[PDB]
Design a protein around this ligand. Structure first.
Ligand SMILES: [Mg+2]
Ligand SMILES: [Mg+2]
Ligand SMILES: [Mg+2]
Ligand SMILES: [Mg+2]
Ligand SMILES: [Mg+2]
Ligand SMILES: [Mg+2]
Ligand SMILES: [Mg+2]
Ligand SMILES: [Mg+2]
Ligand SMILES: [Mg+2]
Ligand SMILES: [Mg+2]
Ligand SMILES: [Mg+2]
Ligand SMILES: [Mg+2]
Ligand SMILES: [Mg+2]
Ligand SMILES: [Mg+2]
Ligand SMILES: [Mg+2]
Ligand SMILES: [Mg+2]
Ligand SMILES: [Mg+2]
Ligand SMILES: [Mg+2]
Ligand SMILES: [Mg+2]
Ligand SMILES: [Mg+2]
Ligand SMILES: [Mg+2]
Ligand SMILES: [Mg+2]
Ligand SMILES: [Mg+2]
Ligand SMILES: [Mg+2]
Ligand SMILES: [Mg+2]
Ligand SMILES: [Mg+2]
Ligand SMILES: [Mg+2]
Ligand SMILES: [Zn+2]
Ligand SMILES: [Zn+2]
Lengths: 206, 97, 120, 25, 96, 81, 87, 217, 129
RNA sequence: AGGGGAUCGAAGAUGAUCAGAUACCGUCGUAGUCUUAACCAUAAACUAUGCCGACUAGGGAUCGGGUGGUGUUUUUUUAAUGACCCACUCGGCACCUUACGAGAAAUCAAAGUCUUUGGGUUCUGGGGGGAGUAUGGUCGCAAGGCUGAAACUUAAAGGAAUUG
C-alpha cells in the first residue's frame, strides 16, 4: 500500500543537491544499476534521486523493523562515514562498527569484536568488503550505500549516492536516522524540518 | 605444467616471429620473447662533465648521448640484466618500475 | 635494546582497561598498586609491568592508542561532536547543471535554477 | 639416454640390420 | 557431442568402430589371435603333464635371497621345455 | 536482468542494438527524394547508393559511392519519405 | 507430502525465494529473510507486523538481490517509481 | 553449565524452539553442538574410518590422526564430521562434535505407491565430492541400502530404509565418498518436486518473535 | 549448421532458469517447438509464451517461473515400442511419481503418461522435470 | 642439376682447458648457408586444447568496417575535407575481474551449460616396458616417410598438488 505523502518533499530535495549526491560516479557503471537517469557529458552520470528517497523509506522501513533495534549494525571503515555511523548509531538502538572491521566478527563467536546483528548497513562495499562477504555466511541481510561503481554483489536494497564526495554520506545517515524515527519512535509527524541539523555527521578533516 | 600463460612473451596469433640474437652471448631468441632494454646512457660521468666543458669551445652547446636497443637471451638476461626472478604471483605484474 | 615482552604489555593494557580511576601517571604510585591489585610473582616483573602502564597512561592524556578498551572513550567522543553550522543554505540561489535541472521535473516541483554547459 | 639419441641409435641399428640381410637379398 | 556420431543411421560405424577399438583389450586380442594355442606351451589346457629334465635351484628375485627349487620339464604332448617350481618345502627329494 | 520485458523493449535500447539483433528484423536504411535546384522533377535515391546516380535528363552527379554514406555533393535537399 | 491415509508425512516443508522461486535449504546459509514493517498514519512503523520476503543465496551472490528486489517491492506497492520493466 | 554465546543458543535453553526443523526452515547457522545435542539427544556415534596423515616440518615429522564419524538418529538427520588431532581420542571427540553441527535433514519418500511409512527417497540424488560421485536411486521397500559398508551405515543413520546406490570414481578414498554420499542426501531437500510448488506464507522466525528473549548483555 | 532446432530452444530454457531469470527469447520457433512448450505449460513447468512473427522462421518469448529442474531433448528420435516406454522413464526421470518424458506419436506429440492413457507410441522427443 | 658461394658454419684440423676433453671457450674451414629446376614431407609443425551451431558474465583497452555531431583542431575567410574526441554496433588479436559452473588439481568464458548423463560430425587413446621394434605392403635417388605386430617381461610408470 502506498502509505502517505511520504514521497520526497520539495525541500528535502535541495537538502541533497548542495550535499553532492546527484553527481554519482564517473562514466563507470555496473550494469546492475538502472538508477542512473539520463546522464550528463564531461564525466559523471546524474542519479534519479526520486528512487534514493524511496530507497531510504524502504531502508528505514526495515531498519526500524527489528524488534531489538539494539542489534542492527551500521559500518563505515572508510572514515568519511565514521563521524556519521557513530552519530547515526546515537539516534538509534543500533550498535555501530566504525574504524577497522576486525574480520571474522560474524563467524568465530569466540572473538570479542563479535556481534550477531539481524540487519547491517555499510557505506562502501568496496572498502568494507569483509563486512558484506561475512554476512553471507550467517543469513543476515545488508542495506548498502552505493555509487554507480559500487558492486551490488551480496547486497539487499541499495541506495544510489556518491561515495566520492565531501558531504553526501551523512545526508542519508541523517535521513535514515531521521526517517528511522519519523517512523515508529518519537519524532515529528508534519513536514518536520527535523530538529537535528544535517551537518552533524559531517566527516571532519582535523 | 605451464608456469606462464604466454609460455614466452607477447605472442598470440602469429605462428612465427623473426629471431633476434642476444647481445651478451649471441644466442638466437625470437624478437617477441627477447627481453628488451633501451640503453640511453650519456657520455657523462659524475666528475667527468665539468672538465669536459670548462676547458672547451662551445660552452655546453648540445651534450648528446648513446642510444641503442638491447635484446637479451633469457639465460643471459637472468645472469646480469633485468630478470630478478619473481614469485608465483608477483611475476604476473608487468609494471616496469 | 630492551623492548618489553608482550607478557608485561598484555598485562598493562588489561589493567588500564579496568583501572583508570586509579593508576595515576606516576610509577611509584602505580608500583605499590600492583602488589595490591595484581598477583605478579616478582619485583622486577611487576616493575616493568607498572613502569609500562605509566607510559601508556602518560600517552592517553595526549590522545588514544590501540588496545585501550575501558568503555569510557566511546561515551567520551560520541558527544564531543556537533561542530559549526554553515549548511548550504545561502549560495546565490541554487547552482545546477544543463540536465541536472531536468532530473525530477518529471515528478518534483519548481526550485531555484542555474545553468552549466561544459565541454571535454 | 636422451629421447632423440635413442632414435638415432635405433635408426643406425636398422640401417645396419637393413644392410646385413641385403647381403642375402 | 564430442566423439561418436549420434545419428539414428550410424549403427554401422558404431559397431565397426567398437570392433576395431576392441583390439586394445588384451583378453579380447589374446582370445582372438589364439596365442593360448600358438604361444603358452600348455596347449591352452588347464594342465599339461611332462617329463623332468634337470633339478634346478633358482635364486629368488630381490629384495629376497633364497634358492627356489624348480625342475625343467619337457611337455610330452608338446615337446616344449618349461621350468616349473616345486612348492611345499621338501618335495624336491620327491621329483627324482 | 532476471526480470525483463523481452516483448516490449524500449525504443531506445532497441535503437542502439544491431539491425538484425532487434526483436523483428528491420533495415536501418531509408530513401530520399533529393532535390537539386537545377531541375523540376528529381529522383528518389537509396541511402547506400553504391552507384552515383544521374538525373533523368542531365548529367549532374548527385551521389558518389562510399562505405554506405552516399555523399550528396551539389548541396541539395531531401526527405526521409 | 501426504501418505495413504491422508496424513502429513515428510516433515519440514522448507522456505522459498520470491525472485527465483527456488528452495532455500538448511545449508544455504547465504540466503536471507527481510521483514519490511508496515507503516501507518504519519510514520508510526507498526512493530510485530511485516510482509516478509525471502531471497536465495544464489540471487544475492550474482548481485541481482537489489535490482530484483525493487521490482518485488513495487509489485506489492511499497515504492512509487523505482524499477521499470524494460531498458 | 552451558553458558551460551550465539543467542539462538539461548533460544534453545529457553524452550522457545523445540525442533531443528525451524532452524532449517530459516536456515540458521548452528555454531554450538548442545543445540543439536538437545534438539535430538538420541544421536549415535559411529566412527567410520581412522587414517594417519604425515607432514614434514623443519623440526620433525608430525603424525596427526584423522578420523571420520557420522552421527544421526535413524529418522532423517545425519552429520558427517572429520578432523585430525595428534591423538585418536581427541580427534574422535572433536570430530564427534563436528558431526553434530554438520547434521542436515533427509527428505525420504515412497518408491511407487502411497501406502504409509516412507522408506526410500523422493528422487535420485548425486553426491559430487572430490572425484567420487555417489548416486542414491529410489529403491522399493524390501531392497535395503545397497552400498559399501561405510555408505550403508551412513544411510542407515540417515533413516532411509531402502535405496539404490551407484558410485563412480576412486571410491577407495572413503574420506571423499562419504562426503559425497553426504552431499547426496544433503541434496534431497533441494528438488523442487511438484507437490512442494504450493506458495507458503514465509513465516517469520525465532530471530524476531523471541527477540526480547535472546537479549544478550 | 543448426541440427535439432528443438534443442537450441530447450537448452536455452534450461540455461535461462538456473541463471535465475524468468524470461528467455528462443529461436527459431518451429511448430514442434510450440507443440512442446504447450505440453510443458499443461503441467506447469513454464508459464505463457508469445509467438513473435518475423517474416522468417519465427521467435518465441517464454516466461518460466521457478519449477523446472531439467528439460531436455533426445537427439536420436529413437523409436520406442510401447513395451519399453517404462525403460526410458526409469533411466532419465527422478521418480515414477512425477516428471514426464515427452515423445512423438501418430496420435500427436504427447507426454508419456498421456501416451500410456491412449495406448499409442512413436519416437522419443525429450523429457521435462 | 646449374649458378652462387660475401657471411656465419655440422665435418675435419688446430690452440687452450681437464686426471681424460673427440666438447663447451678460441682459430682455420669443407659441406651448407643463397637462387633456379626437380625431390624429400618430417618439427615441442604447440594453444601440447577438432570443426559447424546454439546458450550461459562483468569489465576497460585495442585492430577493421560502419552509424551518430549547433564535439575540439587545421583558418583560408568559415566550411569541404583530413586528423583527433565521444557513443553505439558487426567481425578481429588479446588482456582483466569474477564464479554461478567445471576440474584430480594447476587452472578454464570454456576446459562451462554431465549420474538432473543425448545439437551435427571427424579423429585418436584403453597399465608400464617390450617398440614405433619385427614382419609384409607402399612412397623416395638416398636419408628416410606412411601402414605397423607379437613372444616374453613387469607392479607400477604416470599426472597435478603438499610438505620437507
Ligand atoms: Mg618445470
Ligand atoms: Mg613464441
Ligand atoms: Mg611454429
Ligand atoms: Mg596476595
Ligand atoms: Mg632402464
Ligand atoms: Mg652379397
Ligand atoms: Mg595400439
Ligand atoms: Mg637350463
Ligand atoms: Mg597331439
Ligand atoms: Mg579401510
Ligand atoms: Mg506384443
Ligand atoms: Mg661457401
Ligand atoms: Mg672438431
Ligand atoms: Mg670447464
Ligand atoms: Mg686437444
Ligand atoms: Mg669429433
Ligand atoms: Mg670462427
Ligand atoms: Mg607427427
Ligand atoms: Mg607453443
Ligand atoms: Mg583460450
Ligand atoms: Mg599428452
Ligand atoms: Mg565478455
Ligand atoms: Mg563522422
Ligand atoms: Mg567485440
Ligand atoms: Mg573457484
Ligand atoms: Mg569452484
Ligand atoms: Mg616389490
Ligand atoms: Zn644471451
Ligand atoms: Zn545527375
Amino acid at each position: 500500500s502506498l502509505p502517505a505523502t511520504f514521497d520526497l518533499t520539495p525541500e528535502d530535495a535541495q537538502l541533497l543537491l548542495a550535499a553532492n549526491t546527484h553527481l554519482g560516479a564517473r562514466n563507470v557503471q555496473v550494469h546492475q544499476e538502472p538508477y542512473v537517469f539520463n546522464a550528463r557529458p564531461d564525466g559523471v552520470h546524474v542519479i534519479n534521486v526520486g528512487k534514493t528517497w524511496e530507497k531510504l523509506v524502504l531502508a528505514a522501513r526495515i531498519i526500524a523493523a527489528i524488534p531489538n533495534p539494539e542489534d542492527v549494525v551500521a559500518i563505515s571503515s572508510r572514515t568519511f562515514g565514521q563521524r556519521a555511523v557513530l552519530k547515526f548509531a546515537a539516534h538509534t538502538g543500533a550498535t555501530p562498527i566504525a574504524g577497522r572491521f576486525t574480520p571474522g566478527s560474524f563467524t568465530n563467536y569466540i572473538t570479542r569484536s563479535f556481534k550477531e546483528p539481524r540487519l547491517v548497513i555499510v557505506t562502501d562495499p568496496r572498502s568494507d568488503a569483509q563486512a558484506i562477504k561475512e554476512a553471507s555466511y550467517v543469513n543476515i541481510p545488508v542495506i548498502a550505500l552505493t555509487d554507480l561503481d559500487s558492486p551490488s554483489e551480496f547486497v539487499d536494497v541499495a541506495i544510489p549516492c556518491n561515495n566520492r564526495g565531501k558531504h553526501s554520506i551523512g545526508l542519508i545517515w541523517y535521513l535514515l536516522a531521521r526517517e528511522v524515527l519519523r517512523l515508529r519512535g518519537a519524532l515529528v509527524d508534519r513536514t518536520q524540518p527535523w530538529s537535528i541539523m544535517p551537518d552533524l555527521y559531517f566527516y571532519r578533516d582535523p | 605444467p605451464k608456469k606462464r600463460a604466454s609460455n614466452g612473451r607477447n605472442k598470440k596469433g602469429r605462428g612465427h616471429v623473426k629471431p633476434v640474437r642476444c647481445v651478451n652471448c649471441s644466442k638466437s631468441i625470437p624478437k617477441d620473447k627477447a627481453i628488451k632494454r633501451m640503453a640511453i646512457r650519456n657520455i657523462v660521468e659524475a666528475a667527468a662533465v665539468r672538465d669536459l666543458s670548462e676547458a672547451s669551445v662551445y660552452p655546453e652547446y648540445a651534450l648528446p648521448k648513446t642510444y641503442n636497443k638491447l635484446h637479451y637471451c633469457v639465460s643471459c638476461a637472468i645472469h646480469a640484466r633485468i630478470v630478478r626472478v619473481r614469485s608465483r604471483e608477483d611475476r604476473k605484474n608487468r609494471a616496469p618500475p | 635494546g630492551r623492548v618489553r615482552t608482550k607478557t608485561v604489555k598484555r598485562a598493562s593494557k588489561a589493567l588500564i582497561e579496568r583501572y583508570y580511576p586509579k593508576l595515576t601517571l606516576d610509577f611509584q604510585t602505580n608500583k605499590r598498586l600492583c602488589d595490591e591489585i595484581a598477583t605478579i610473582q616478582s619485583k622486577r616483573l611487576r616493575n616493568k609491568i607498572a613502569g609500562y602502564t605509566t607510559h601508556l597512561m602518560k600517552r592517553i592524556q595526549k590522545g588514544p592508542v590501540r588496545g585501550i578498551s575501558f568503555k569510557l572513550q566511546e561515551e567520551e567522543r560520541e558527544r564531543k561532536d556537533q561542530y559549526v553550522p554553515e549548511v548550504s543554505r545561502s549560495n546565490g540561489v541554487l547552482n545546477v547543471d544543463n540536465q541536472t535541472s531536468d532530473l525530477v521535473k518529471s515528478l518534483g516541483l519548481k526550485l531555484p535554477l542555474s545553468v552549466i554547459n561544459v565541454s571535454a | 639416454m636422451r629421447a632423440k639419441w635413442r632414435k638415432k641409435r635405433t635408426r643406425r641399428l636398422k640401417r645396419k640390420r637393413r644392410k646385413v640381410r641385403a647381403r642375402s637379398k | 557431442g564430442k566423439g561418436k556420431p549420434r545419428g539414428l543411421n550410424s549403427a554401422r560405424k558404431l559397431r565397426v568402430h567398437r570392433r576395431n577399438n576392441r583390439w586394445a583389450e588384451n583378453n579380447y586380442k589374446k582370445r582372438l589371435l589364439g596365442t593360448a594355442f600358438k604361444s603358452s606351451p600348455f596347449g591352452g589346457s588347464s594342465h599339461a603333464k611332462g617329463i623332468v629334465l634337470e633339478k634346478l635351484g633358482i635364486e629368488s628375485k630381490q629384495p629376497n635371497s633364497a634358492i627356489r627349487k624348480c625342475v625343467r620339464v619337457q611337455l610330452i604332448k608338446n615337446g616344449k621345455k618349461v621350468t616349473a617350481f616345486v612348492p611345499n618345502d621338501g618335495c624336491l627329494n620327491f621329483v627324482d | 536482468v532476471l526480470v525483463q520485458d523481452l516483448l516490449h523493449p524500449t525504443a531506445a535500447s532497441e535503437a542502439r542494438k544491431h539491425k538484425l539483433k532487434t526483436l523483428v528484423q528491420g533495415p536501418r536504411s531509408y530513401f530520399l527524394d533529393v532535390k537539386c535546384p537545377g531541375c523540376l522533377n528529381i529522383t528518389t535515391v537509396f541511402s547506400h547508393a553504391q552507384t552515383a546516380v544521374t538525373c533523368e535528363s542531365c548529367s549532374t552527379i548527385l551521389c558518389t559511392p562510399t562505405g554506405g554514406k552516399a555523399k550528396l555533393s551539389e548541396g541539395t535537399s531531401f526527405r526521409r519519405k | 507430502m501426504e501418505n495413504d491415509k491422508g496424513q502429513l508425512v515428510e516433515l519440514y516443508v522448507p522456505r522459498k525465494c520470491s525472485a527465483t522461486n527456488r528452495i532455500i535449504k538448511a545449508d544455504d546459509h547465504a540466503s536471507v529473510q527481510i521483514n519490511v514493517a508496515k507503516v501507518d498514519e504519519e510514520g508510526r512503523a507498526i512493530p510485530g507486523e511485516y510482509v516478509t520476503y525471502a531471497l536465495s543465496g544464489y540471487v544475492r551472490s550474482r548481485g541481482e538481490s537489489d535490482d530484483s528486489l525493487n521490482r518485488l517491492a513495487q509489485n506489492d506497492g511499497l515504492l512509487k517509481n523505482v524499477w521499470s520493466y524494460s531498458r | 553449565g552451558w553458558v551460551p554465546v550465539t543467542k539462538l543458543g539461548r533460544l534453545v535453553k529457553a524452550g522457545k524452539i523445540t525442533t531443528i526443523e525451524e532452524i532449517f526452515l530459516h536456515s540458521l547457522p548452528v555454531k554450538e553442538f548442545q543445540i543439536i545435542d538437545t534438539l535430538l539427544p538420541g544421536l549415535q556415534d559411529e566412527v567410520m574410518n581412522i587414517k594417519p596423515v604425515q607432514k614434514q616440518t623443519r623440526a620433525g615429522q608430525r603424525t596427526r590422526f584423522k578420523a571420520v564419524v557420522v552421527v544421526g538418529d535413524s529418522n532423517g538427520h545425519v552429520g558427517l564430521g572429520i578432523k585430525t588431532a595428534k591423538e585418536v581420542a581427541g580427534a574422535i571427540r572433536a570430530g564427534i562434535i563436528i558431526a553434530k553441527l554438520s547434521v542436515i535433514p533427509i527428505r525420504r519418500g515412497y518408491w511407487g505407491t502411497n501406502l504409509g511409512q516412507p522408506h526410500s527417497l523422493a528422487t535420485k540424488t548425486t553426491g559430487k565430492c572430490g572425484s567420487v560421485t555417489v548416486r542414491l536411486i529410489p529403491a522399493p521397500r524390501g531392497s535395503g541400502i545397497v552400498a559399501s559398508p561405510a555408505v550403508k551405515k551412513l544411510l542407515q543413520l540417515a533413516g532411509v530404509e531402502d535405496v539404490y546406490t551407484q558410485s563412480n570414481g576412486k571410491t577407495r578414498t572413503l574420506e571423499n565418498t562419504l562426503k559425497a554420499a553426504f552431499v547426496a542426501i544433503g541434496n534431497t531437500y533441494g528438488f523442487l518436486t511438484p507437490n512442494l510448488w504450493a506458495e507458503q506464507p514465509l513465516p517469520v522466525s525465532p530471530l524476531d518473535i523471541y527477540s526480547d528473549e535472546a537479549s544478550a548483555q | 549448421t543448426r541440427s535439432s532446432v528443438l534443442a537450441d530452444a530447450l537448452n536455452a530454457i534450461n540455461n535461462a532458469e538456473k541463471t535465475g531469470k524468468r524470461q528467455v527469447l528462443i529461436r527459431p520457433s518451429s511448430k514442434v517447438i510450440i507443440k512442446f512448450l504447450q505440453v510443458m505449460q499443461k503441467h506447469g513447468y513454464i508459464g505463457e509464451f508469445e509467438y513473435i512473427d518475423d517474416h522468417r522462421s519465427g521467435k518465441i518469448v517464454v516466461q518460466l517461473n521457478g519449477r523446472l529442474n531439467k528439460c531436455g531433448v533426445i537427439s536420436p528420435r529413437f523409436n520406442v515400442k510401447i513395451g519399453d516406454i517404462e525403460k526410458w522413464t526409469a533411466n532419465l526421470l527422478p521418480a515414477r511419481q512425477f516428471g514426464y518424458v515427452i515423445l512423438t506419436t501418430s496420435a500427436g506429440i504427447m507426454d508419456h503418461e498421456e501416451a500410456r492413457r491412449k495406448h499409442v507410441s512413436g519416437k522419443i522427443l525429450g523429457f521435462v522435470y
